[PDB]
User: Fold Neural hemoglobin from Cerebratulus lacteus.
Amino acid sequence: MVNWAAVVDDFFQELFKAHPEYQNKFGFKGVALGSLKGNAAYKTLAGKVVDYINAWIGGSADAAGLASRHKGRNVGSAEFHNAKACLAKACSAHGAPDLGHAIDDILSHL
Ligand code: HEM
Assistant:
């Protein structure tokens, strides 16, 4: 039983460390990284990312839909390549399987 919630938390720490400006697009803009887990906007968003990972594992993920919604937020290939690397670190740090192919699937629609 992978703790995907823990992996996603480390994913966002990696993501926003390397690219702080990405955080500006979220409802938790401006919040200190060490404080994120206590922020209500963050908790909801991280929960949806955990949901997406479990949908991919479970076979129900909609990569086309997720890509389209991110393009709608002006988030594209460059950002998702960066996210891929950040998620790879977060999985490794928790002994979790690599999610590279899930990200590749989103990338194919970007
Ligand atoms: C591993 C890569 C990523 C995954 C799996 C992912 C997944 C998700 C999910 C499931 C949502 C919830 C709403 C929806 O389903 O569309 C979401 C929202 C969002 N994501 Fe991502 N995302 C990723 C990378 C990124 C990156 C790099 C950015 C760069 C800024 C980003 C920006 C956003 C924004 C702005 C929202 C909406 C926030 C809001 O409505 O308040 N995402 N993402």
